[PDB]
Write a protein that binds this ligand. Structure first.
Ligand SMILES: [Ca+2]
Ligand SMILES: [Ca+2]
Lengths: 218, 287, 11, 287, 219
């Protein structure tokens, strides 16, 4: 994947982990504004290997790592649908689940018939059992280093998002933690792009000078 | 090219699909290379690529690089503009002092005659009559220095007796600026001809790369002197803009009305052809 | 059809 | 300055705190301005800034630009404080015919001697003895034309009697390719020396614009004919791949084993200094 | 409004804008994690002049500037009330608006009398006119600087938030923009605490060295 702005001479490719440093505060703030307004503004463009423009729905933009909720309605919907598909891939297990649900429905139905008030019921479904169990991704995060790892896991799980972008998220992590994040990104194959106001020492990054010239580092 | 492109703003320049690509955070614009004659960079914050410089050298487009003060610093000179240059070097080495002094004397006579025409259009009878007397008194080897006297009387008559060419005032600064631009265009034309620019047609002792282009650009100085005389009260910025308006304005050649670049190109071509053919015809430019 | 093209401040 | 900075890789150039910042994908290097002497750009992917161009204008360092073919195209010409190379070109215009004939005869003798020595390494005693006899029989003004006579013997020995330079074949195209690369290297060295490549050592033919570098690269020509003789059965693409390894391969200079770039640089410097000093010493290169 | 952590020897007071720079990445990340988890963790303690500890509901934490939603039901309601007060401060404008609303009510009343069914109504007020107009803040085209400025303007509208805190928000703004933010914060009287890994030049700030020594810095 490649990103192209009118400040760069040629579009730079983003593969696996990428660190982009902008030495101009105006170009950095205007670049983040172009990231949030990407749907509205046509200045900032992104061209994949197919050389096709991507909608803002396919771009994942995350600034605050701790403030980003891992559990969402769409994420829980895709997770519950995935578990329902996994249970549907095995006929015998789903048959046993239907038998147990039939037994529980028979017991609760007998208890309802024992009551003096009329009771009407419909049925119980596997999706209602998963939602009743509260299946969700683990919400326990001790530090931002683990939370960013969970963000990388959920990002690699989501097929619709072709790119993940972090804005000034490298200031919290230590150099060694940055090395572990880069190695985990190279192992996960996902495309991650970082935007930092200042350069980081010890790691390979693309430095954008105030002259607008882009130069590689390390 | 017909178009002089001036970039005073910070931006990045690239070459894509025979097209000059101007990329800046506010907007991006593409300008074809075939329409572009001269490229001028007036600031130090502009970025360019060596591939676009190679495409500019192949397109034979003059590239000028200025300083932070916006005054021109250094221009790009291509090594080989055409294959006829290597064959023209032998002719330049075979030139004769009689043809050089004759063509240079005729050119100086055209410059002094243009100054007398400028003072005549300015309705000065004594000044243009004296400059015309110096034009009729010009001789080979210039023993009387009637050209320098014509310049001293010209500037002293136009700008006042207290004025001088050695002053640091914005008038002499604009004069040196226009002489630097016209010297850059004439030098680029000499590079198109292929002959050595360092070899002058007047004094063989003086060694300068701009000598020949200055000798070819001597008759056109009064065109800059006119706008410099009209805008002298205006600020140096407005005087520089009026100096940039000379490229948009057209002048009347003996044949017809043409642009300044075409008149300089055809004039330099007739000068080189006259030097190789030993004074067949001398091109004359009048205001 | 402009002879002088200016990219920058228009002066 | 002293060190000559040449950029053969993609990179960006900036100027910060009287320090030239060269930035490449592998590493970033900062060089003092006073240490740099001549700056040359080998490829078209290099990015530079106009501010560093202005600092180079204040530092007088010569800026050399090259095309994709690596042949030098244009060079930066400042309006004031010109470089000493422009003053050195006048000596090249003053080169005597006796020194040019001596250097040319020495170059032809070196090339013919390298051809006969290469034929001796190929274990042909009669052809190498004939080419050596023509080498000992070479004289000024070239009335015998022993070089053109040793040509047919060298090529006829290498590729066979049926092969010739006029015929169109992958061997001839490979020879023109190797001669194009060597002409690019020697032409870049001559451009580094500042002397005009249009003026040749051979007084007969001024047609080629590279005549100076084409005459200087003759003693190294047979090293291309050796690899072309070994790879002659391979396709032109494989011959180009084999000829591309000559830059990485190391050759034996008279003084010490060195790379081809340093050897061509020292040979060109000795040739220019010998031409300006009127034959102090003639650089000799043997395979 | 004093904040205290185990690293500091004494609780530091936060008045108007305050720039806190932590040179250690470990203590900075741990402090931010203690800012998000503040209700769970007892290490970071923020108290007012009454020494009473403020609840996490009273604390306002902000990291992403453009991702935060400035438009809320309470903010828009209190904003409409503020606009109604601004219109009420001028008697002439209120009189003219009352006249126009009277005309429109007359027209609609005539249209209701023309109908066959019996119709009743009450009034068309100014708050209902503002709610019908849909007055709201526009963050769509706003720059990050104008977004933070609008957040400082709506912080007075928020009743429950005791203190506003920004996490690494000073890296986007230029020094002059930071001077405008601080100078505006002094007029707004709100308590803002900024947390940055690197020190900003030209502004007064509290620097925490890797030695864990807190010192005031003019630049
Ligand atoms: Ca109502
Ligand atoms: Ca409405």
């Amino acid at each position: 994947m490649k990103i192209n702005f009118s400040l760069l001479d040629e579009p730079m490719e983003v593969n696996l982990g990428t660190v982009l440093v902008i030495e101009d505060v105006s170009v950095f703030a205007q670049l983040v504004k172009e990231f949030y307004q990407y749907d509205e503004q046509s200045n900032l463009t992104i061209f994949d290997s197919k050389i096709r423009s991507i909608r803002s729905s396919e771009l994942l933009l995350i600034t605050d790592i701790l403030g980003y909720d891992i559990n969402t309605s769409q994420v829980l919907k895709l997770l519950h649908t995935d578990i329902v598909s996994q249970l549907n891939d095995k006929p015998e297990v789903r048959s046993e689940i239907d038998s147990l649900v039939s037994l529980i429905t028979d017991i609760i139905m007998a208890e309802c018939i024992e009551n003096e008030l009329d009771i009407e019921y419909d049925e119980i479904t596997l999706l209602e059992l998963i939602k009743a169990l509260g299946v969700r991704i683990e919400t326990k995060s001790c530090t931002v280093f683990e939370k960013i790892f969970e963000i990388l896991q959920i990002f690699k799980y989501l097929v619709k998002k072709r790119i993940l972008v972090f804005v000034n998220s490298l200031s919290y992590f230590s150099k060694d933690e940055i090395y572990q994040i880069l190695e985990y990104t190279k192992l996960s194959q996902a495309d991650v792009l970082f935007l930092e106001p200042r350069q980081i020492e010890g790691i390979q990054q693309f430095i954008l000078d105030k002259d607008y010239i882009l130069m590689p580092y390390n | 090219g017909w178009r002089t492109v001036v970039v005073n703003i910070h931006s990045k320049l690239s070459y894509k699909n025979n097209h000059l690509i101007f990329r800046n955070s506010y907007k991006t614009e593409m300008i074809h290379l075939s329409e572009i004659d001269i490229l001028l960079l007036e600031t130090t914050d502009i970025v360019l690529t060596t591939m676009l410089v190679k495409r500019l050298v192949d397109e034979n487009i003059l590239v000028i690089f200025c300083d932070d003060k916006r005054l021109p610093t250094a221009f790009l000179t291509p090594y080989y503009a055409r294959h006829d240059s290597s064959l023209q070097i032998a002719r330049q080495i075979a030139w004769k002092e009689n043809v050089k002094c004759e063509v240079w004397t005729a050119i100086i006579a055209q410059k002094i005659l243009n100054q007398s025409y400028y003072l005549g259009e300015c309705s000065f009878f004594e000044k243009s009559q004296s400059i015309m007397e110096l034009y009729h008194g010009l001789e080979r080897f210039d023993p009387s220095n009637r050209e320098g006297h014509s310049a001293r009387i010209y500037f002293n008559t136009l700008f006042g007796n207290d004025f001088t060419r050695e002053s640091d005032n914005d008038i002499n600064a604009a004069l040196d600026y226009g002489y630097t631009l016209l010297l850059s265009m004439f030098a680029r034309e000499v590079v198109v001809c292929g002959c050595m620019t360092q070899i002058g047609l007047k004094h063989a002792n003086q060694f300068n790369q701009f000598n020949l282009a200055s000798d070819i650009m001597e008759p056109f100085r009064p065109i800059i002197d006119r706008i410099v005389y009209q805008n002298r009260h205006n600020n140096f910025v407005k005087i520089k803009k009026e100096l940039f308006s000379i490229f948009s304005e057209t002048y009347l050649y003996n044949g017809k009305e043409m642009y300044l670049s075409n008149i300089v190109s055809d004039y330099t071509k007739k000068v080189i052809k006259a030097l190789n053919q030993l004074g067949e015809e001398i091109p004359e430019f009048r205001i | 059809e402009e002879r002088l093209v200016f990219l920058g401040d228009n002066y």
